[PDB]
Ligand binder design. Structure first.
Ligand SMILES: Nc1ncnc2c1ncn2[C@@H]1O[C@H](COP(=O)(O)OP(=O)(O)O)[C@@H](O)[C@H]1O
Ligand SMILES: Nc1ncnc2c1ncn2[C@@H]1O[C@H](COP(=O)(O)OP(=O)(O)O)[C@@H](O)[C@H]1O
Ligand SMILES: Nc1ncnc2c1ncn2[C@@H]1O[C@H](COP(=O)(O)OP(=O)(O)O)[C@@H](O)[C@H]1O
Ligand SMILES: Nc1ncnc2c1ncn2[C@@H]1O[C@H](COP(=O)(O)OP(=O)(O)O)[C@@H](O)[C@H]1O
Ligand SMILES: [Mg+2]
Ligand SMILES: [Mg+2]
Ligand SMILES: [Mg+2]
Ligand SMILES: [Mg+2]
Lengths: 372, 372, 372, 372
């Protein structure tokens, strides 16, 4: 025990590394896949469940299912499997090798974090462990102490404002529109072209289309009228079976959902009015220093041209005299793990762990009160 | 010990300097601010209480509270904090570097001054110290020996008459209507426009509006009828979050309170009948030399057009044959500290100090009888 | 014209009746709902906006929005719609059938009342009309002339002291914490159990949970420790889709906000220190007769066990020698309309109306000065 | 032009009639058959392609092929042939005799509907035409305005929820398991008895077996164990060549696919979890009124004992306190045409047509936006 594990259990992509490094060493999708055909060969009981990286290569014969959705762990036997695969088969370190720094989204059920802690203590027997907040670590990665964080991951999208050290918990805005909800919308708007992706394996193909051809239109209606000259926008993607598909205005109608949540039948406001409505609930004096630091995090905020549309639509709401400046790091996809590597390597933090003794003698309610 | 400290502990703005200078070197608001949110960053026990100048810049996340109100020190742990911040972090001189000349309003409780003295002796260990009267120092600054002093500060407003050297203590008129009481009235008459300032941070924004847009109408009803042509008076102020507000006849209804104390539900007379009623209690011969010298002091008497309204409404009461002349220096805001720099640099005064020895051997009742 | 209309436009629930009756005849929630889906049937332009009672039954496909919030009318086209629905479709009387007695909260913008009057005169053409004060009518319903009124409605909560006939306007304490602000807090503390109500329709379900399962703990910390024996308190509510939910210590953490306004991130004092601080600003002699009559009004003051907690926490502040007695009528929910039925049926009042002639020839500024 | 044509182009059975009638007049299978032998007689070029009813009687020497599959028109020269056979040889009315009301399944490619419209305008020259939705017409036939529609036809099976007028498009669940997919499964499970139907003509014999001997077992495993007493279930069908066959537990293993889509190697859920999962995506308030109206449509939902199994397996999922009631009309096979005869005879609809002028001057994109 000299270094510590930093294991960000994303909603769709598990990242894990060592406290002190500059980038995680174990980045693999958080899937659990079961085989659904008979298996006539002699490999009958041969790996009745694949996890992570293999469950993506052999995904032709597998029903893939995520153990996490919308930040809430819904399948505990698959999450123990994914963890046990991270510690042993990917990081190749014992659990009691180091303390652990897990991460979870804000405003989650009180039972999810307690069950995380119980598993990590009574099944892997970690010496110590601490559960950070995905939106406070995203500032550490940027070396700031003030700003509003839009940490739109893959299962959840949340705004968290933080003045110079002090978080304002009464203004945290959560919203359950994220990357998976855009993949499922791209699966639907693609039928109108003729392509029908239905299975759970085809889902991981539309995810790949989304990550490669989809951009966010700076203005929606102008680009939608530009798609009438139906050649200056269409791109072609090559499926795994050699077939080709051509998507046109589906390139910006998939990520426009984040600004038009009524597309997928949600009565909520875009990520430009859950950031502005969150700044208009902070006290009037810190309102000027939050406009100038909208740090962005999470994978889904990697769409080409999302920082500019945010910066253009917030400035259309905020008073016209002061500065809007979206701070989009180039590595923001890992911006939550990087922060976790920083906070776990600070000397000021080497106290806040929750050790096995302190857990057993204080009950499972000890893990909530460590800073909210 | 060659120079002496002159530390005027105002009711809302602490001023402090060196005996002999021409203007104080340490002018900072007398606030103590506590943080009220959690503070998720590693700065947990990072400055659990801000004082003075910082507690004004970071006032977004702070509950600000004044340790003094109406001249009476109501929170002794905050006043020691503000003093200790004046001596060390602002003047950068040791306490036992010099004697001190404190100041306090007339007719205060007998315990307030005694506790001031006890703190200064047993906690900062000043060599000597003396407590002047805010209304006798305001004449020194003007180089006079006769006149009536209307020292309307921020916590209290008091008239004190003084003939050629001899104060008349039986005519000192105190009144608890001051700058804070006008700020709280501007916070109320502003709702009727729609703007709602409720917090303790917004209080320091309505104070800023008051100090910039508020004037005193020479005649009230005429100006109130002029505000019917609802363009020739309205001004626009820009809040810290870029929003703008437009105040009209609220510009002269906030400081009219001093002449109409029934606005804030007080049964007392304006500052034009607590000066006149104080001259009509002085003996009939000195009554002519007090009309001609109404020196004015204190911050709140900086409203544009207050000297003229005083000079116009007293002359409507006093007998019609003799002169009314309001003497309003251009620097009267510091007129109490300037005087304190004079009286502490006189050779005739270098005796009246109360030294540590003279204090211990005479008890805490030695500090009242040094000239009232 | 023999009887008169009494139409209390609450902040969340419109009540309307006839002057002289014993209880209002038209009590319906003040909502305006728009449809948000396409509407494929032949009912295309079929009721493009529902109001009041229908907009509550069909609230599955509707975005519901209140035209009033915090007593200030923010959407004038919806308020005309709700009025026009009260007069014609609910009371079934013409507007010029009778004069009207509207009601509004104290310390509102000067434009809200003027626009109310302009609408009622130039769009419904009422013969006469008068705007009372929600806290002076709540005494008429009780047959008193002395007492302090805590009229905590659904948009605003205000204390108003009244000695024998004479109101003390310099002590009226307003506070913007009310029923809607508690519903939005119950929407937040319920996520920690797992239930996520996000829409505007689910808001009217958490309102129903609040009105049925929420009580006010006589002592907070004792009950919060009693909720550790996590069976003796939990209740079960059945949602409209047959699902069941179980709320435990959320039953008294929702209405505790009124005594702990820092829960929802407000820097103000509970309704036990905005009543006490309002009595300590009335003159020392009437201070004894206001302690003995804390009449309570408004809907939100119907929580089981709120009168006892008020009576127990004020008595912990007021001097220990005299009587505290909270007067909580059993019908206080309508206590403001009942009073309006009394004052509009008095012979002494049949003068104070503002008739169309008196309005046009005196301008829209005639409606403020009728008793404040 | 006084009446209008209502031509439901099913996926396997074309129905066509007149707007206003009570039942279609032209119900014929939508097949196109080519001869595949030489034809030695003098009838060389004698009807080189048979359509509809003849292509079923002479199906011994014909290769039969459907021009539609899974709702998508895949062979446009055969679909023009089938239409031209409906208008002229079966209805015996000119195309420009009346406007037309076509029908198509939800979530189809955007090109299929546009090509339908282009053909009907530029090749038959209909005066007007409109394309309804197979699941909104199935309610008109029942005289409802609220309910969920399970319109399992012959090429596609889709659930569509509709509250009182307003469809919820974000919850429409499509699934490509239908009657043809059950015929092809009965062609496979029949080999295990010895009977081998391979041709395209034998397909229309296994379809006939399916329509006559197949029922849906109320409970699967119990009936499958009852088929061990291998006499109480077996039925005997007589092929067209006098041979007889005896099918036993193949009677309920063919339609069980709709509840066990993994039989034909599909990773999807039965029609009891694409209805329940569609109600659990509608808003929580309309969830109670959709449980009580599961109107059923389409041919394949005519299996003896399917309404009871649906009503028994949904009630095992939905909360146990409220009502499940499958509304299965006795004529539901035509329930989509009946509705089309109603909507085309309403006065409220006589506007929504798309006339030739309105088409040419607005382009082929005018036909999508007429209500989705
Ligand atoms: N380059 C990209 N462009 C657009 N979307 C992306 C890109 N990379 C990842 N995504 C989306 O973001 C998700 C990954 O986000 P991530 O931050 O890993 O989520 P989590 O917070 O669960 O870790 C993926 O599911 C994918 O849908
Ligand atoms: N230029 C100005 N115009 C109007 N009011 C002012 C102005 N400057 C200060 N004030 C008011 O006067 C107060 C400062 O008065 P000051 O003399 O410092 O009080 P003290 O006697 O406590 O030192 C401030 O609180 C402010 O409300
Ligand atoms: N029995 C009850 N228990 C608790 N809260 C209630 C109860 N009845 C109503 N409320 C709350 O009070 C509000 C109604 O108060 P009301 O006096 O009608 O407001 P207004 O002053 O706008 O008329 C509702 O919004 C509801 O939240
Ligand atoms: N009585 C029946 N029992 C079982 N299946 C039937 C019955 N009648 C028809 N079918 C099946 O339903 C199909 C006809 O359904 P239909 O509603 O005509 O489809 P479409 O939606 O294309 O019109 C046929 O292909 C047949 O397989
Ligand atoms: Mg993340
Ligand atoms: Mg002063
Ligand atoms: Mg009310
Ligand atoms: Mg059909």
């Amino acid at each position: 025990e000299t270094t510590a594990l930093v294991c960000d259990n994303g909603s769709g992509l598990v990242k894990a590394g060592f406290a002190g490094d500059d980038a995680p060493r174990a980045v693999f999708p958080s899937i659990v896949g079961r085989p659904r055909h008979q298996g006539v060969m002699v490999g009958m009981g041969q790996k009745d469940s694949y996890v992570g990286d293999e469950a993506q290569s052999k995904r032709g014969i597998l029903t893939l299912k995520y153990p996490i959705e919308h930040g809430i762990i819904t399948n505990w036997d698959d999450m123990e499997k994914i963890w046990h695969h991270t510690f042993y088969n990917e990081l190749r370190v014992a659990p009691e090798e180091h303390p652990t720094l897990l991460t979870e989204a804000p405003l989650n059920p009180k039972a999810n974090r307690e069950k995380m802690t119980q598993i990590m203590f009574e099944t892997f027997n970690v010496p110590a462990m601490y559960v950070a907040i995905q939106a406070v670590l995203s500032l550490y990665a940027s070396g700031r102490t003030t700003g509003i964080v839009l940490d739109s991951g893959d299962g959840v999208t949340h705004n968290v404002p933080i003045y110079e050290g002090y978080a304002l918990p009464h203004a945290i805005m959560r919203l359950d529109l994220a990357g998976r909800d855009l993949t499922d919308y791209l699966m639907k708007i693609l039928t109108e072209r003729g392509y029908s992706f239905v299975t759970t394996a085809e889902r991981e193909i539309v995810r790949d289309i989304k990550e490669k051809l989809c951009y966010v239109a700076l203005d929606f209606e102008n680009e939608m009228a530009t798609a009438a000259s139906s050649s200056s926008l269409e791109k072609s993607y090559e499926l795994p079976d050699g077939q080709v598909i051509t998507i046109g205005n589906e390139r910006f109608r998939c990520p426009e959902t984040l600004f038009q949540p009524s597309f997928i039948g949600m009565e909520s406001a875009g990520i430009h009015e859950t950031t502005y409505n969150s700044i208009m609930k902070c006290d009037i004096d810190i309102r000027k220093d939050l406009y100038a630091n909208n740090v962005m995090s999470g994978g889904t905020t990697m769409y080409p041209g999302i920082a500019d549309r945010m910066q253009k639509e917030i400035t259309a709401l905020a008073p016209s005299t002061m500065k809007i400046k979206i701070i989009a790091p180039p590595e923001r996809k890992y911006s939550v793990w990087i922060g976790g590597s920083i906070l776990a390597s600070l000397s000021t933090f080497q106290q806040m762990w929750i050790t096995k003794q302190e857990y057993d003698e204080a009950g499972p309610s000890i893990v909530h009160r460590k800073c909210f």
